[PDB]
Amino acid sequence: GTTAKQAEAVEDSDINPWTGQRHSERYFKILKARRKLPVNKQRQEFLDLYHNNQILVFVGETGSGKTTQIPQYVLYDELPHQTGKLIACTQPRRVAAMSVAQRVADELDVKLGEEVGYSIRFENKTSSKTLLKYMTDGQLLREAMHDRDMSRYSCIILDEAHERTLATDILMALLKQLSERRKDLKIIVMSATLDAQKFQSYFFNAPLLAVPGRTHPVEIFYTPEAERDYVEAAIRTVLQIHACEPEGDILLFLTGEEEIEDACRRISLEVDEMIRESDAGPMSVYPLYGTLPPHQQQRIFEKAPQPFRPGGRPGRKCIVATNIAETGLTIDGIVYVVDPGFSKQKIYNPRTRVESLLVSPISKASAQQRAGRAGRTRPGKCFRLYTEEAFKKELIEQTYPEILRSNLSNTVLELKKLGVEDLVHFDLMDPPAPETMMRALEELNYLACLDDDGELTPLGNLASEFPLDPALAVMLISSPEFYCSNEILSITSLLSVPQIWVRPANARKRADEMKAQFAHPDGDHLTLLNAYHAYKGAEARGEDMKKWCHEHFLSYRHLSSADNVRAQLKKIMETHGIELVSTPFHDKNYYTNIRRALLAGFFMQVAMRESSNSKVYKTVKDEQLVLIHPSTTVTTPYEWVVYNEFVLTTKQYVRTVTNIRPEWLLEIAPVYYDLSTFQKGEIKNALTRVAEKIRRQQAMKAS
Ligand SMILES: Nc1ncnc2c1ncn2[C@@H]1O[C@H](COP(=O)(O)OP(=O)(O)O)[C@@H](O)[C@H]1O
Ligand code: BEF
Ligand SMILES: [Cl-]
Ligand SMILES: [Mg+2]
């Protein structure tokens, strides 16, 4: 029963209890400011709730001291038990876990990597001396794959569960099960914008600890009129702050990497025309996105420029960022936050099995977390570029969970690697529908990624290593047996992105003209492969590919993404010892090999023509009646086709269609097309005739 005042006396000591060295003067200056935080008045109320409850819910305002102080409150309590375990705190972003770990190491007067450290995907800045670890939720989930009981941690702190990521929602379900299995494990879930009663009721009616109060206020300013060009409204507001507001840096939130790098250039050019004319101060402009290098990512903590003259307008720092800085980070010197209200949120197309990023409105919880990046070290204000009534009535309260916006079949294979056995009764906080979960289990069993008992096959474990929809990964893994593994490697990448065709309403004719350069009459998949080959062909000549894709009416963003995916997918097969073969182009079976190899992943998406009079096709799965989509490069479709996408519109269509032979269905997928147990119907009768026709064909040639 170690009290808070007992621990404060150790914090006030000259000697570091963790290292045995003398405390620095910087440590005491930080500790004096740490105790003015709103969580410090309730340190004993926290310890009373922590000793008596296994799972704890913590809420407090942005900047209260949740991330920085509570693991140190736990660390002072947990060391006398001599467990040899560690304290784990999860942040959803890599830069947030790195920056906080350097802060808490400074707060504890230790060197980063020793008693306090971080662990991310490709860096583990820990050691034997490490006691507190600030990791990501994905990195803790990767350790849960090899250690399902998490035997290395005595306390798990799930910081910022409000973002509801894929790793966080899974970790909440895993730790809730582990709470019944392990009673020597403590679980803390904390956030500032949280459905606390929902998180309470999920964790076996756990207690709640509410901390009121802010360190510094944040004034919320709204625009009276809606402005559509949010980039123009953002750049206008940043220049207005540098002109007419006192000293203090700006944090700008925009959606994508290309959006801010244009905006970082447009701001710096309009700043330089404010310097020469309006006699304002200098402005440093810094970008921040996820694909940016870390040594340039750490430049956002770089000091504001000084003014040109003593007594002049203040020099300023503008950080234009994505929502990578929405949570967790405390950037010193930020006074102003501009909120356009948009972010790139992951969506899932169920017909094409593609996870893509869409610019969408942020939630109410994201706006408060964005405004909470100020008001931490000094008072601040947030400029929301939207109506107050748009905040109250148009914005949703909580961000939609990532597990409902992701590929469920990819999620299921990761959960089997985590040790989950009952998937339909897995207690997620917001689970998918049981029709949706069983459909993922139905497809993954037919793809041989799961057996009939439901356990993970070695095909499913290997398909989980690829960042693809699992039907595309089975197609890539089976590709060397069809002698077209270099070609399927490109086709899976183009099928993992949205459609590359650009058909504007003002230029339909010129769009179809450039598309017909790549058109293959046997399949749309070969038309995709031809267009990617033309992209990589003009790239080797030295042409401007943005100019090339615009003139050839192709999406540059989707084609360049598939080229980066194909480089990723090519490396995964090389490290796993998979052959990478291709047939020469003038082989008689070059194109038939590629059309055969599509059925290794897409045997379930097959249509059969009903009658010779009709253009209506009937699908194998669920007997749907479809037409061929008019975007097809197939001039005359066969009686049997494979398709990538079911299209529901005023008429039911199938898109990305390739002609196949029905005898390939029995060869490639015999378990699904087992005619012993197949469903009665016209497709079965047509398939048994195909098996009989090749039977009388081969037997008479044996005669
Ligand atoms: N790098 C830093 N530099 C200066 N002050 C910091 C830093 N990190 C945190 N702080 C201070 O500690 C407070 C608590 O931060 P934190 O614990 O992350 O807040 P929250 O509880 O909102 O997650 C901040 O409001 C700020 O006053
Ligand atoms: F809630 Be805090 F801004 F991490
Ligand atoms: Cl997201
Ligand atoms: Mg925090």
Secondary structure string (H, E, C) spanning 522-585? CEHHHHHHHHHHHHHHHHHHCCCHHHHHHHCCECHHHHHHHHHHHHHHHHHHHHCCCCCCECCC
Q: Looking at ligand 1, which residue's alpha carbon is closest to its atom 5?
A: 377
658, 598 contact by CB (below 8 A): yes
Residue 689: CB atoms within 10 Å:
11
Residue 634 burial (CB count, 10 A): 20
Q: In angstroms, rounded to a whole number, what is the distance separating the alpha carbons of residues 568 and 561?
A: 11
Cα of 335 to ligand 1 centre, how many Å?
14
List CB contacts of 425: < 8 A, sequence separation 6 or more.
Answer: none
Radius of gyration of the chain (CA): 29
What residue owns the CA closest to ligand 1's atom 3? 332
CA distance linking residue 446 with residue 350, whole number of Å: 18
Q: Which ligand 2 atom is the nearest neighbour of the CA of 192?
A: 1
Element of type H or E holding 219: strand 218-222
Instruction: Identify the nearest ligand to the CA of 163 by its number.
Output: 3
* E strands present in 613-651: 617-619, 625-628, 640-648
* Ligand 2 atom nearest to CA at 376: 3
Ligand 1 atom 6, closest CA: 330
Give the distance (Å) from ligand 4 centre to CA of residue 160: 7
Ligand number, closest to the Cα atom of 358: 3
- Taking CA atoms only, the protein residue closest to ligand 2 atom 2 is 62
How far is Cα 348 from Cα 408, in angstroms, rounded to an integer?
10
Going by alpha carbons, the residue nearest to atom 4 of ligand 2 is 328
Distance of CA 409 from the midpoint of ligand 3 (Å) = 18
What span, in angstroms and rounded, lies between the C-alpha atoms of 331 and 62?
13
Query: CB of 162 within 8 A of CB of 130?
Result: no
**Which amino acids bring their CB within 6 angstroms of ligand 1?**
37, 60, 62-68, 103, 192, 215, 330, 332, 376-377
**Residues 319 and 234 sit within 8 Å (Cβ to Cβ):** no
User: Tokens 């000091």 sit at which residue?
Assistant: 303
Q: Which atom of ligand 1 is nearest to the CA of 64?
A: 21
- Whether residue 371 contacts residue 416, with contact meaning beta carbons closer than 8 Å, is answered with no
Query: 322: phi > 0 → left, psi -120 to 50 → alpha, else beta; which?
Result: beta
Ligand minimally distant from the alpha carbon of residue 30: 1
Q: Which tokens is 122 given?
A: 């490709």
What is the CA(339)–ligand 3 centre distance, in A? 18
Separation between Cα atoms, residue 32 and residue 37, nearest integer Å: 10
C-beta neighbour count of 462 within 10 angstroms: 18
Structure-token match 């309590």, residue found: 77
Work out which ligand 2 atom sits closest to the CA atom of 60. 1
Lay out the sheet containing 316-321: strands in order across: 218-222, 380-384, 334-339, 249-253, 316-321, 283-288
The residue nearest atom 8 of ligand 1, judged by CA position, is 330
C-beta of 375 in contact with ligand 2 (< 6 A): no
Whether residue 494 contacts residue 564, with contact meaning beta carbons closer than 8 Å, is answered with no
* Closest atom, ligand 1, to C-alpha of 61: 22
Task: Report the C-alpha gap between 551 and 342 in whole angstroms.
Answer: 30
- Report the binding-site residues for ADP: 63-68, 99, 332, 376
The 3-state DSSP class for residue 441 equals helix
DSSP state, residue 501 = B
70 lines ligand 2 (CB under 6 A): no
Structure tokens at 513: 């003209």
**Which listed ligand is nearest to 66 at the C-alpha?**
1
HSE-CB of 461 using CA atoms within 13 angstroms: 9
If DSSP codes are grouped into helix, strand and coil, which group holds residue 61?
coil
Q: 218-403 falls under which CATH superfamily?
A: P-loop containing nucleotide triphosphate hydrolases (3.40.50.300)
- Rounded-to-integer distance, Cα 619 and Cα 617, Å: 7
Report which residue type is found at 636: T
Name the H helices within 206-286. Answer: 230-244, 257-278
Which residue out of 37, 58, 67, 91 has the highest number of ligand 2 atoms within 8 Å of its CB and is therefore the one to mutate? 67
Residue whose Cα lies nearest atom 3 of ligand 2: it is 62
How many CA atoms, within 13 angstroms, populate the side-chain half-sphere of residue 48? 6
Q: Which of 192, 250, 210, 239 is nearest to 382 (CA)?
A: 250
> For 349-386, b where at least 16 C-beta lie within 10 A, e where not — what string?
eeebbbbeeeebbbbbbbbbbbbbbbbbbeebbbbbbb
Q: State the Cα–Cα distance between residues 481 and 503, nearest whole angstrom.
A: 36
Give the distance (Å) from ligand 4 centre to CA of residue 182: 27
The closest ligand to the CA of 365 turns out to be: 2
Give, for ligand 1, the residue of 27, 68, 132, 194 to mutate: max count of ligand atoms closer than 8 Å to Cβ.
Answer: 68
Cα of 358 from ligand 3 centre, angstroms: 9
Backbone angles phi, psi at 552, to 5 degrees: -90, 5
Q: Which CATH number applies to 4-211?
A: 3.40.50.300
Q: Which atom of ligand 2 is nearest to the CA of 159?
A: 4
Ligand nearest to the CA of 69: 1
CA proximity to 370, closest of 395, 352, 406, 393: 395
**Cα of 598 to ligand 1 centre, how many Å?**
53
Q: Decide: 372 in ligand 2 pocket, CB within 6 A.
A: yes
Residue 143 exposed, middle or buried by CB count within 10 Å (0-12, 13-18, 19+)? middle
CA-nearest residue, atom 1 of ligand 2: 62
* Binding-site sequence positions for Mg(2+): 67, 159-160
Could you count the other beta carbons within 10 Å of the beta carbon of residue 249?
26
Q: By what technique were these coordinates determined?
A: X-ray
Cα(392) to centroid(ligand 4), Å: 24
Structure letter (DSSP) for residue 179? H
Rounded to an integer, what is the distance from CA 340 to the centroid of its chain? 21
